Write a structure and sequence with these properties.
Largest interface: A-B, 15 and 14 residues
Number of strands of chain A: 5
Structural class of chain A: alpha/beta
Domain Thioredoxin (chains A, B): 5-110
Number of domains of chain A: 1
Strand order of the largest sheet of chain A: 1-3-2-4-5
Helix content of chain A: 25-40%
Strand content of chain A: 25-35%
Shape of chain A: globular
Oligomer: homodimer
Subunit structure (chains A, B): Monomer.
GO biological process, one term (chains A, B): cell redox homeostasis
CATH superfamily of chain A: Glutaredoxin
Family (chains A, B): Belongs to the thioredoxin family.
Subcellular location (chains A, B): Mitochondrion
């Protein structure tokens, strides 16, 4: 569990690394068939990586983990949730630029 | 198999029942996390059923069939393609009503 950016591997994996996380979490709902995920994905990844443990990123492939999309009421991809202490505390849908992502992550972190 | 409306089971099933069909085909890209597909889905189904063999409906769950959504450049759900002799001849995205679905099917069938 060394990396701040990680693919969610199952149901238990989500409960331990997101719902019971000790840091704030960005949750990226994505799919292989969605163009804008290939841009937003790496962009947010590098931005979260630069924070060195102040925020983590849980990537959720919507095709691999259709239950999590159902639970979190994801209606479209890309969907990113900010989570803290189990609670959803912010959300966007779609592509954001680097100034936008910085603003989102500073609002979450403090 | 006797039904005009069916779930696509795999890759070979798509090749047999869509690419090599001798009747026009409506292809419904849907997902269990997508609200609007619970409306459009049965609505299209009923209207296809009433044409008695003049058009076929191939349902494709995108989470069970990621390859097909990459191939056909599906970016969001509901996506419906109209297909004839292996080729995409019309497209819509999102819900339509029964008047609009009637026009879409008359454009494809004749």
């Amino acid at each position: 569990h060394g990396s701040t950016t990680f693919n969610i591997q199952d149901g238990p994996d989500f409960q331990d690394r997101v719902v019971n996380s000790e840091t704030p979490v960005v949750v990226d709902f994505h799919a292989q068939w969605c163009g804008p995920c290939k841009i937003l994905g790496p962009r947010l990844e590098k931005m979260v990586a630069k924070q060195h443990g102040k925020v983590v990123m849980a990537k959720v492939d919507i095709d691999d983990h259709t239950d999590l999309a159902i639970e979190y009421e994801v209606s479209a991809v890309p969907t990113v949730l900010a989570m803290k202490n189990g609670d959803v505390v912010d959300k966007f849908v779609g592509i954001k630029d680097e100034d936008q992502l910085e603003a989102f992550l500073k609002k979450l972190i403090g």
